[PDB]
Amino acid sequence: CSPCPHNWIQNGKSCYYVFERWEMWNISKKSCLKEGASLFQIDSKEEMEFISSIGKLKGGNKYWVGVFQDGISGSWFWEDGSSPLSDLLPAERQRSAGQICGYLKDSTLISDKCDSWKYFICEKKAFGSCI
Amino acid sequence: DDDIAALVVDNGSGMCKAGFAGDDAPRAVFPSIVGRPRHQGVMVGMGQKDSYVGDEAQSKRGILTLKYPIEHGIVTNWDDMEKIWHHTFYNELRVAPEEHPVLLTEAPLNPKANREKMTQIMFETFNTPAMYVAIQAVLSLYASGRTTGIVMDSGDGVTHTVPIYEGYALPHAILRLDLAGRDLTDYLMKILTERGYSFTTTAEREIVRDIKEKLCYVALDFEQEMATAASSSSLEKSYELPDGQVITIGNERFRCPEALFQPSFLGMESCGIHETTFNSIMKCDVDIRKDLYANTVLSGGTTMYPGIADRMQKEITALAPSTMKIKIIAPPERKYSVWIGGSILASLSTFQQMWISKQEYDESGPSIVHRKCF
Amino acid sequence: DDDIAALVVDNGSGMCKAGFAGDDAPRAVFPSIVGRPRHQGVMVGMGQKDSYVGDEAQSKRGILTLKYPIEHGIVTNWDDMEKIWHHTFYNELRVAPEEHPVLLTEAPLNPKANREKMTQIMFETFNTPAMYVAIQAVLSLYASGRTTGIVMDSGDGVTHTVPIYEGYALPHAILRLDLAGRDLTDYLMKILTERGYSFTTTAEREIVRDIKEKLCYVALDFEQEMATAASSSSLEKSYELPDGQVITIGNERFRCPEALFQPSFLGMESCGIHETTFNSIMKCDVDIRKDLYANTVLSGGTTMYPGIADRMQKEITALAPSTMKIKIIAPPERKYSVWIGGSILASLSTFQQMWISKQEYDESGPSIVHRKCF
Amino acid sequence: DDDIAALVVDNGSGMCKAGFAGDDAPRAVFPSIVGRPRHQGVMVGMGQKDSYVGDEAQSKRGILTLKYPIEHGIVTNWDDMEKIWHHTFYNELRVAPEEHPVLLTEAPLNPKANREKMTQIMFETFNTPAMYVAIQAVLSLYASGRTTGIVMDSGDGVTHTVPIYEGYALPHAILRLDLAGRDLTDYLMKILTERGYSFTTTAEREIVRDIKEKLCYVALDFEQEMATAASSSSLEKSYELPDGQVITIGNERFRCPEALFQPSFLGMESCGIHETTFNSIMKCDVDIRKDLYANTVLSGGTTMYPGIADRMQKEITALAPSTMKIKIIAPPERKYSVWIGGSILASLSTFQQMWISKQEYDESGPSIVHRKCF
Ligand SMILES: Nc1ncnc2c1ncn2[C@@H]1O[C@H](COP(=O)(O)OP(=O)(O)O)[C@@H](O)[C@H]1O
Ligand SMILES: Nc1ncnc2c1ncn2[C@@H]1O[C@H](COP(=O)(O)OP(=O)(O)O)[C@@H](O)[C@H]1O
Numbered sequence A: 001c002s003p004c005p006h007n008w009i010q011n012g013k014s015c016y017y018v019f020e021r022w023e024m025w026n027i028s029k030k031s032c033l034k035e036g037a038s039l040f041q042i043d044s045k046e047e048m049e050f051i052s053s054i055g056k057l058k059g060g061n062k063y064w065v066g067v068f069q070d071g072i073s074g075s076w077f078w079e080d081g082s083s084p085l086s087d088l089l090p091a092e093r094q095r096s097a098g099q100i101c102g103y104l105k106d107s108t109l110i111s112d113k114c115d116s117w118k119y120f121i122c123e124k125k126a127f128g129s130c131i
Numbered sequence B, C, D: 001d002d003d004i005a006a007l008v009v010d011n012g013s014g015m016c017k018a019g020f021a022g023d024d025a026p027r028a029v030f031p032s033i034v035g036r037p038r039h040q041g042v043m044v045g046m047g048q049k050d051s052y053v054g055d056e057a058q059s060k061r062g063i064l065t066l067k068y069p070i071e072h073g074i075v076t077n078w079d080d081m082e083k084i085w086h087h088t089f090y091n092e093l094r095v096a097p098e099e100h101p102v103l104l105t106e107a108p109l110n111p112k113a114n115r116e117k118m119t120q121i122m123f124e125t126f127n128t129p130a131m132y133v134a135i136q137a138v139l140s141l142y143a144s145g146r147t148t149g150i151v152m153d154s155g156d157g158v159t160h161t162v163p164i165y166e167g168y169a170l171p172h173a174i175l176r177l178d179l180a181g182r183d184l185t186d187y188l189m190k191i192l193t194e195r196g197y198s199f200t201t202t203a204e205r206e207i208v209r210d211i212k213e214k215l216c217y218v219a220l221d222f223e224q225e226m227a228t229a230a231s232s233s234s235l236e237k238s239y240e241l242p243d244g245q246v247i248t249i250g251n252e253r254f255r256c257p258e259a260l261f262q263p264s265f266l267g268m269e270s271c272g273i274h275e276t277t278f279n280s281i282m283k284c285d286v287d288i289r290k291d292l293y294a295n296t297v298l299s300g301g302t303t304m305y306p307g308i309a310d311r312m313q314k315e316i317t318a319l320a321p322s323t324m325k326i327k328i329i330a331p332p333e334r335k336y337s338v339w340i341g342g343s344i345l346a347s348l349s350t351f352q353q354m355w356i357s358k359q360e361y362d363e364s365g366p367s368i369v370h371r372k373c374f
């Protein structure tokens, strides 16, 4: 139908879906795949600033995001495997065992364990209009 | 001029409906509550109506208080009730009660004492030329127009199933349910509140009510529906609160109405509708049963859920012997069906003797309306 | 000659305003302080009045001291207060109080004790026929003729937001802000000092008061305004001191008024007017809210600054649901609003019964005014 | 060394109570706020902790800002909570999380989602071997050890009546009440500000709260005492404020607590506690009800005021039928009894399987705690 199938929010070119439920990162990816959506990846601050619009979604929830970490290198990429700019990348802890692809907790990107459950957000291109 | 109509007023638990006979549907329908400022306090001037409620309360919402003088569909009080009747006549109908006959309608177990009082008001204060006392269950049936079948009537306060064979309702078959939309909304509130919303208030009451009526639906399979819910994108539907919050409502929509099917949600021991239907059937003769099964009729506000009909056929068919044919029917605007039947009976030229008259009030007293008449 | 006028004395913190009910605006208006030569010094001759204050004090500036019995609206001491009243009646009004029923205004959490005291003075010393006492905000609200809305009142001493539904100030929602008015001027003296000016004195405070009212404005954006300031050819405006000094002003301009929006300038913990409206908004029912958002009015002298309405609208939407409509209404001569409210209510012949009589005063004591009336 | 404690931590709205199971009382208690200099203003050198709160802020009172992640019991924000827990174990408990299994308690209607979140934090950040999260109400009831009865449980944020029959709490029966100690504290400042005083600020809330406990008593007869008020010398009892000031109190003393009986004071429509209990009792079977009447247990916090029991007995006697036995029981120091329940529950060896484990977390995710257990 319209630029976004229902229950999706549009921001410019993109369409976003905030999942009702918790899924694992990989799992949500498969789920996202079903739609033909992807996980959301944040190319710009502008897009990141839009996240706040999640804020109305009740409370902040952690939301799985595109960025993934290699493990040996620990380099952060998105599913497409581009490089996030500095702004996107994660924050530090003293140390421990474990770490995986980022989520979004409200304002800022974060990292966690995949095995854990988190809400994921998917992104698709809106049917951009041409005349 | 000459000729007379019958005023058809059904004194609903929540919403009373009244009109003229011959009308297809009630001219008036308004809240049946009483309400004031809880806070009050005070002002320069007034111009307020202390406890109209009515339309104005509903618009009123935040300010006012609600009593229902007939919550359990039973005139719990005469003082307020007169007010409803007064409002109905003068305000909404803008008829003079002097001119026309009225049919009041009554809830099913209405103790023969109140009936006399119902009558005495109409004669005494109202001074109607004549009035009839009706049983709303009946009037609903009258509207339907079918002799045999087993109809499920779920309204606001109460749910019944009644087998009907030629036209006579077999008393014994019937069984009562406490549950109806009345409970449903409360429940809706309660589930809503878990998530974090708090819908404690009366204003909030009405908000909850709105949410269920548009929003809520009945599941094909209760179990499947939960399971789906997890994946379910769809269920997520938004509702905008009057303030401007937007609150999201997935699962509750199906869970709420489910209660009718499974009363234990609400903590009713009582069996769900389907068990009800089966039971009422059993109670009757083996021979008759087929007739009911073919003709099941739905009725009342609570029956309006889309999906009910298919669930019912699904449910019943499992229960019933594979031979027996099962049909389900649901007339389109059933909620009104009570008023409708009332309307019809009232109008009846032929039946007119049935109406209760001023003299009869005098000689026999109001009790006449109860005895060897309605 | 007959009939009577209501003497609507509004005892203001800084300014007494009083006149006759029915009048469009306050007749006579003057600063409430008490002052006498601090220095004194003697002379040959006399012909100075010890502590009139009033107008004569203002031009008086260097010579006099000040004293506000009415400090925070609340009448702290009766003796001076009576002096004000005597002056008001006799000097400005030139009218003898025995003749006219009078309504007095009083501040928000004014204790019962003082209210009674107010009555004693009005009856005993003045011997007016009857009095009424009023609560200033309601008089303001009365003046408006707004049944519903959420209003910002900002005057001299205190700033409130009260939502109203049906002419009812819902007590709970209301909140107070310490600051107004005063806090602006003092901040104004202080921020001014830093530049190198000293405005410590009383005369100087008067000077300082002068500047803010003409000089100051509020910004579209604090952050943006601050950035701009460096360029700002504009802000630089000059103010000539009564001695004849000139000063440059203008980063000051926006900043002082800034206080209301972010009290931390003052060091005030409390939240901004904007957030204060929001807090109040939530306090009310969700249902009521659209009404409030739609009807927002600001009241009081502090509300007069140009630009506020546009700012407030902007501030509030940012708060608000997005869907919801926004309106900011500001009536033109609002400062006088309280007095006007004084005049209308006072002037109500219909209402006249409210007027408190010496008979009640003697029998009931002054208390009758407080209890069951105003 | 072998065998293990259960770390029983009680995340209260205002206060956390914590310590080892089997412990007669919680060892450590401290406020739940977050607090860093509002003013700040730098200096030379630091040494301060940005927002420890707990004990130290309380001593800090003038300086600091207060926040409750735990506002209405429910944890709104994880970080501060992470902080709160960090303090709990390390600073106050001086225990290490890895060593001991921990219980955690929860507000009544807690969203599942946060349950997994709570569950998440302790394992991940704390790296506790195993955890249990229990419902505070349930622990309290555990503490009583009363299989049956009806207990009135009034703490800080909320008030409940929970009928209990045979170790089961019947969910339909139990109603809520927003009003609770927090409202009382706010309430009391307001009426005190009424006469003289102004207790706007955070410190002042603490001051009033101090007044609140020592000062407050319930009145035998609301009406009567007011009559008593004029004559009463006794009421006048005096309090000295943290500066110099010594303030007088006395009518407000009873009046504040009055709210529990009359919620309207605070603007609450809802029925009083006496009201609440009756309704809840009616909710249950007639047969059972005798039980609740015999056993009514007080609980929490707000129930401590002397003389509540008899008034409570009185009100209920009035409500009840004449025959009925009524008995009120209030355990001597109930506030803790929430924590008490935990200590036992945690401490239960037999029960020990009950605890949630790292593996159950690991397989199940966190939700195992929520699902099919606590
Ligand atoms: N379209 C609808 N869908 C679902 N429920 C409805 C609908 N319309 C009304 N209801 C519910 O049914 C009730 C009205 O039905 P009614 O037969 O008038 O009940 P009663 O006769 O017992 O008052 C209302 O309480 C409402 O909650
Ligand atoms: N035109 C104006 N622009 C800005 N501020 C004003 C204006 N007129 C009055 N004020 C300020 O508002 C105050 C008067 O408002 P008012 O409502 O009378 O306060 P209050 O009722 O608390 O005494 C004065 O202290 C003055 O500083």
Ligand SMILES: Nc1ncnc2c1ncn2[C@@H]1O[C@H](COP(=O)(O)OP(=O)(O)O)[C@@H](O)[C@H]1O
Binding pocket: D012, D013, D014, D015, D154, D155, D156, D157, D158, D181, D182, D212, D213, D299, D300, D301, D302, D303, D304, D305, D335, D338
């Ligand atoms: N001795 C007492 N007398 C009166 N009130 C008390 C007393 N002790 C505590 N309180 C009040 O009860 C509250 C603590 O009770 P609690 O059951 O812990 O509440 P919650 O569990 O909701 O936090 C405090 O807010 C306090 O104001």
Ligand SMILES: [Ca+2]
Binding pocket: A014, A041, A042, A043, A123
């Ligand atoms: Ca993108």
